[PDB]
Design an enzyme around this catalytic site. Sequence first.
Site, mmCIF file in Angstrom:
data_model
loop_
_atom_site.group_PDB
_atom_site.id
_atom_site.type_symbol
_atom_site.label_atom_id
_atom_site.label_comp_id
_atom_site.label_asym_id
_atom_site.label_seq_id
_atom_site.Cartn_x
_atom_site.Cartn_y
_atom_site.Cartn_z
ATOM 1 N N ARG A 1 0.852 -1.184 0.000
ATOM 2 C CA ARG A 1 0.000 0.000 0.000
ATOM 3 C C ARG A 1 0.887 1.233 0.000
ATOM 4 O O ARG A 1 1.644 1.457 0.950
ATOM 5 C CB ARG A 1 -0.947 0.017 1.202
ATOM 6 C CG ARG A 1 -2.032 -1.042 1.151
ATOM 7 C CD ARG A 1 -3.413 -0.426 1.245
ATOM 8 N NE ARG A 1 -3.716 0.055 2.586
ATOM 9 C CZ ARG A 1 -4.752 0.826 2.887
ATOM 10 N NH1 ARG A 1 -5.607 1.226 1.960
ATOM 11 N NH2 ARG A 1 -4.936 1.202 4.149
ATOM 12 N N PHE B 1 -0.607 9.996 2.283
ATOM 13 C CA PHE B 1 -1.157 9.462 3.525
ATOM 14 C C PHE B 1 -0.148 8.614 4.289
ATOM 15 O O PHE B 1 0.134 8.913 5.453
ATOM 16 C CB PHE B 1 -2.425 8.655 3.219
ATOM 17 C CG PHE B 1 -3.114 8.100 4.435
ATOM 18 C CD1 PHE B 1 -3.035 8.743 5.657
ATOM 19 C CD2 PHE B 1 -3.845 6.928 4.347
ATOM 20 C CE1 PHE B 1 -3.669 8.224 6.768
ATOM 21 C CE2 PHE B 1 -4.481 6.406 5.454
ATOM 22 C CZ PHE B 1 -4.394 7.055 6.665
ATOM 23 N N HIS C 1 -4.060 3.163 17.021
ATOM 24 C CA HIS C 1 -2.842 2.444 16.687
ATOM 25 C C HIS C 1 -1.753 2.774 17.699
ATOM 26 O O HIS C 1 -1.752 3.848 18.306
ATOM 27 C CB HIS C 1 -2.365 2.796 15.276
ATOM 28 C CG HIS C 1 -3.379 2.528 14.208
ATOM 29 N ND1 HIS C 1 -3.435 1.338 13.516
ATOM 30 C CD2 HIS C 1 -4.375 3.297 13.713
ATOM 31 C CE1 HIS C 1 -4.423 1.386 12.641
ATOM 32 N NE2 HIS C 1 -5.010 2.564 12.741
ATOM 33 N N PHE D 1 3.219 0.761 9.268
ATOM 34 C CA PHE D 1 3.171 1.774 8.225
ATOM 35 C C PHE D 1 3.915 3.019 8.683
ATOM 36 O O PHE D 1 3.896 3.363 9.866
ATOM 37 C CB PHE D 1 1.727 2.107 7.813
ATOM 38 C CG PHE D 1 0.851 2.614 8.930
ATOM 39 C CD1 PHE D 1 0.975 3.906 9.411
ATOM 40 C CD2 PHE D 1 -0.128 1.803 9.470
ATOM 41 C CE1 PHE D 1 0.161 4.364 10.422
ATOM 42 C CE2 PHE D 1 -0.946 2.260 10.481
ATOM 43 C CZ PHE D 1 -0.802 3.541 10.955
ATOM 44 N N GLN E 1 2.580 1.329 3.674
ATOM 45 C CA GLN E 1 2.388 0.199 4.571
ATOM 46 C C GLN E 1 2.999 -1.060 3.975
ATOM 47 O O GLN E 1 2.866 -1.318 2.776
ATOM 48 C CB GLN E 1 0.901 -0.025 4.857
ATOM 49 C CG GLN E 1 0.578 -1.376 5.467
ATOM 50 C CD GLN E 1 -0.871 -1.495 5.882
ATOM 51 O OE1 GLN E 1 -1.553 -0.494 6.090
ATOM 52 N NE2 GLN E 1 -1.349 -2.725 6.006
ATOM 53 N N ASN F 1 -3.379 -2.486 12.512
ATOM 54 C CA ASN F 1 -4.227 -3.546 13.030
ATOM 55 C C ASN F 1 -5.561 -3.546 12.297
ATOM 56 O O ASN F 1 -5.983 -2.529 11.741
ATOM 57 C CB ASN F 1 -4.444 -3.400 14.546
ATOM 58 C CG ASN F 1 -5.155 -2.116 14.918
ATOM 59 O OD1 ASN F 1 -5.303 -1.211 14.101
ATOM 60 N ND2 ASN F 1 -5.591 -2.027 16.168
ATOM 61 N N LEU G 1 -6.091 9.016 13.768
ATOM 62 C CA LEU G 1 -5.693 7.664 14.135
ATOM 63 C C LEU G 1 -5.202 7.571 15.571
ATOM 64 O O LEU G 1 -4.889 6.470 16.033
ATOM 65 C CB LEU G 1 -4.603 7.154 13.189
ATOM 66 C CG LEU G 1 -4.984 6.981 11.718
ATOM 67 C CD1 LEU G 1 -3.812 6.440 10.920
ATOM 68 C CD2 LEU G 1 -6.188 6.070 11.588
#
Lengths: 181, 362, 643
Positions: free
Chosen positions: A58, A63, A129, A116, A66, A105, A125
């Site tokens: 990804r 952004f 996380h 990531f 990952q 997760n 977030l």
Amino acid sequence: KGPKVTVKVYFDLRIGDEDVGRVIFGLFGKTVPKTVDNFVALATGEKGFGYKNSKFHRVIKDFMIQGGDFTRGDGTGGKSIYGERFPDENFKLKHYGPGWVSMANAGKDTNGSQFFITTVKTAWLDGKHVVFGKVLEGMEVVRKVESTKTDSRDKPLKDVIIADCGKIEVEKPFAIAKEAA
Amino acid sequence: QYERYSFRSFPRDELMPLESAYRHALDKYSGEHWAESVGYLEISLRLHRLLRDSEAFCHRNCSAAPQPEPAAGLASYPELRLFGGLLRRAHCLKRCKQGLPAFRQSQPSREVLADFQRREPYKFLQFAYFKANNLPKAIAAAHTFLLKHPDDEMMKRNMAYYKSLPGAEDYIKDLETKSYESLFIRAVRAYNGENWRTSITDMELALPDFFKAFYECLAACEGSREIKDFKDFYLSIADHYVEVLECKIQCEENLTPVIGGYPVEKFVATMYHYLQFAYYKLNDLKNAAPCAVSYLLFDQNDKVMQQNLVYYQYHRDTWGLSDEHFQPRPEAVQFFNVTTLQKELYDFAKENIMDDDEGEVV
Amino acid sequence: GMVTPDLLFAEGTAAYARGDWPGVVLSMERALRSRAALRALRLRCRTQCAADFPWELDPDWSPSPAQASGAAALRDLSFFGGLLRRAACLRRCLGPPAAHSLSEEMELEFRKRSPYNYLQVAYFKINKLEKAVAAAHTFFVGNPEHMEMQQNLDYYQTMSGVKEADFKDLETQPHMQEFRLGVRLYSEEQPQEAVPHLEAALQEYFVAYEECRALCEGPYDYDGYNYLEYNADLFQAITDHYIQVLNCKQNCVTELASHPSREKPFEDFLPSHYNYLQFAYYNIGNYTQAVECAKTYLLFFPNDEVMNQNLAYYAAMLGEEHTRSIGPRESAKEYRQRSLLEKELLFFAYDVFGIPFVDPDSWTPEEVIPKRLQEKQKSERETAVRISQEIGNLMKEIDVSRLTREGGPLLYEGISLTMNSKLLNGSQRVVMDGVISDHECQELQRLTNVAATEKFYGVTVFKALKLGQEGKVPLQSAHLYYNVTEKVRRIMESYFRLDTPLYFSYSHLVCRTAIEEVQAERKDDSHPVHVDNCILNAETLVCVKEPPAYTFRDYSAILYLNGDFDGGNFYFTELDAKTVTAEVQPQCGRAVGFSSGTENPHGVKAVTRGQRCAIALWFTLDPRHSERDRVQADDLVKMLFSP
Ligand SMILES: *[C@@H]1O[C@H](CO)[C@@H](O)[C@H](O)[C@H]1NC(C)=O
Ligand SMILES: *[C@@H]1O[C@H](CO)[C@@H](O)[C@H](O)[C@H]1NC(C)=O
Ligand SMILES: *[C@@H]1O[C@H](CO)[C@@H](O)[C@H](O)[C@H]1NC(C)=O
Ligand SMILES: *[C@@H]1O[C@H](CO)[C@@H](O)[C@H](O)[C@H]1NC(C)=O
Ligand SMILES: O=C(O)CCC(=O)C(=O)O
Ligand SMILES: [Fe+3]
């Protein structure tokens, strides 16, 4: 004031068949242990399986990037050294900005082996996380992989391969700032 | 902004969440509209004052709730008694907080409360007052903001510009003032004006007000926290109190009045010194001796007042003094106990409980 | 110090997979040792830190007037100073805290005794047969439905090298091995060898109770991601955590009385101890001990008639002075005295804060339950016998399971019964029409569309109420959502002929949107076929009920809010998820109600070009596994509309 780093693991990325550089992480082995111990064990390959010859699946632009799923390439696998999943330890640190590593997760208490590297301040977030690292050197290399051509599924058209990954000991834990990079 | 304020009869027309009122005020302030922004900022200030006044009223009944004597068998289990008392107090708090109008709105977040305790709205208030031909109110708001932040260059520039204008030299007033500070100032002026009875009355009125404000501020520091770790029972309820204690330590120094740009150090000691001098000048030693003993209690290492106490003690059979008029007043003893206990607890806690995994960046 | 058990278990599992028998035996033994070492360390630290710093209680300290402001501060300072001292002692004793926590899967694996299965296989392949049979017996006692281990034990029995007493259990608690053996000996008319075993059982029971009470001071249990919205003050957080700890401490009497060989805990454990003891003592010939045990049993149940007759007979045989000389045992007195106070505190907390509590004892008098809690129990008892009479009339007038547990009243007016269970090809199924009108359809649809700012968004009733309070969504919509949830609960409870009250588990206002830019070649359903209770494994046509799935749910209901889209049909499926059995068409006013067991596997078809709005509701019959957000929502509604 800021957290103290204790270990340093380094990667050696490769897009296609061309060397790009080296990214050195700084891990907080005192604020959040048992999450650094998972990352360090997979990096050096103590127990056979590791991050060697893995792939970033990804590369969402602006952004994050990952990776770390070594069981299968599609991004729906990964196992830790504590069985399969292990619970979230503590949300003491936040994604303060670019170059902050955290554990990805798929729910609650489902930490595996996928991480990531944050590239823009993701304040939404926070509290979901667990953050356990920070990119110390090579912030210009992580931005090389982000600007690669990607299809609709966010998989890069050109493969990204972690050629090498090791571990550097730190003789004296030195604190860092909670700013960026 | 505070002239038409009443805690009991609060107009129901302006009852809105504090955050929404602040957001509307800021939005209209950025939209180059002045009068409406002024009104909304004033409404937000009144709402914050109402919230504090309501929180300081529901901690009056609960703490002052004489517990009934329990059964005979319960006396042998102290943990159950302590925590049963805690449950009863929590029940009283929860029941009392449902009857007040200020607790039935959307409560503000912690960052907004921190911003309001830092007197941030007064910058916008003074600028909006300036842009609406309200120079006295503008300079008053600027002075009120400067009282809390004595290191803001922009505020110095604005205030110096305000002084340059003619006429605006005697409207320097504090918008957020307390009764005890005014009583203390009046008492000091009367004492300097060689008037004793008026000064004594004003100081004796000012002391209980300061103690009441101090205990209300101490009670208002036991608030919520942000959950980021999951520990056991004692190890987790011994961190909430560590944060609460970090908040409580500064209540004594956040209440001291400022005169001439310098806070009056040793406020209670200064109060008792003034009272002792005034009482001695009236030859009423029956009340003068305990004030001297209290001043000794707060400042142990003195020279002149110790020789004073020697004079009072050795000549006790000159004016008439029993063995009871040589002990500190109960309120001073309670104040000393609370302050010393809190300092000792914080000193102990920041060696054995506080985590050490952060350093100083070099 | 001691490495975490889960890492050693993972190493052993990997070694078993590769085929390295010394590796697996070594790793499994190390894991088993380390778990017990950590448990002993925790117990020792907690006990020693509690013994070092007693609470010591506040002195008399009459409050006094005009001085009641500083006295409260002094009392609080004393309490929190003692607390800080105890916390410092614990922090010094325990050490690193990361090793004491492990996931639920690992705890379940250690509870099911899987390392002993691995160890028995490894020991058999290593030629150490004695430990192999020991591990096989331990695992077989752990799981009584495993036939393969029974066959392995039989094969070991055929081969020489063992005995009948050679079999040993290494996991069962010592106080439980002595109770069953003593009971078995007593049932064989051998009272002489039964009394010492029962006395040892009593001693070990008290020791194990005191040990198990010291391990209940653990982390607080937030409801998933509800720690991000937790705004409790200091004295409310303390009472929340203390009430949870007290509940855990009280739920140990039902854990010390449970054995894996049975599906139900022993009834009245300690009074049964005393009953068998008094019977055995009378049989042996000792009489003072017999009357003492009879008295200490009547201490718990003072209205028994058989034990009263036995005590009267013993007293008549003996003399009056002796029978008046001896009384009960002091340990039982102290145990009962402490448990009564704990129960009183828990019942007060239930009455006031609405935190549920289910009594684990049957000897509790009626004087510890508050007045309001007593009326509710009476009403729940009356409705249990009214439903039973209704069922009897239907049976006396006569597929039993389709007539005696379906076909309810449907109290509310304006609701029809479109399809019953017979027409839906199954059992415990229903489809009702016209539960809500079209105005409510539009109201709920706009509530769930405004609150948003394939795709998926769902809002719970508590969050809807909070948003309405803040000012982002209308308040009347949240109140209507609350009302419709309660109405559907009542209808579902009444139709299925339930006597035990039906509680809440979860509610959710979902909304599914289909993006037409990725509608090319979509060959998957919007929701795969599943089961709300089990976790489904269609390869073997069976499910297993485990912690990863919400096994406490009993009933489900779905209420639709619109009918303008393509697809989205709700269909029931048999155990192998390939054949449809029934299908319904969504329109608002439709309610689909069914039991969420393994008999009703369901799924949702693919949604294309439209919106699917619905409310999903799950109910439980267990008062402990209720929704913790419904109490707060009811408190919000009480103070917002009727203050
Ligand atoms: C606190 O509120 C209760 C509510 O009934 C009242 O009885 C009590 O007198 C109040 N306390 C004071 C000091 O007014
Ligand atoms: C309060 O202070 C006085 C004098 O400073 C002292 O004698 C007394 O012991 C203190 N009380 C407590 C509870 O520490
Ligand atoms: C009954 O047992 C107790 C101890 O269990 C013993 O001291 C006593 O002598 C016994 N009585 C008789 C009559 O044997
Ligand atoms: C919900 O039901 C209550 C009955 O207790 C009623 O008073 C209220 O008006 C209802 N609200 C709506 C929106 O129908
Ligand atoms: O929405 C539906 O039709 C089914 C939902 C369901 O069964 C679930 O959430 O488990
Ligand atoms: Fe379902």
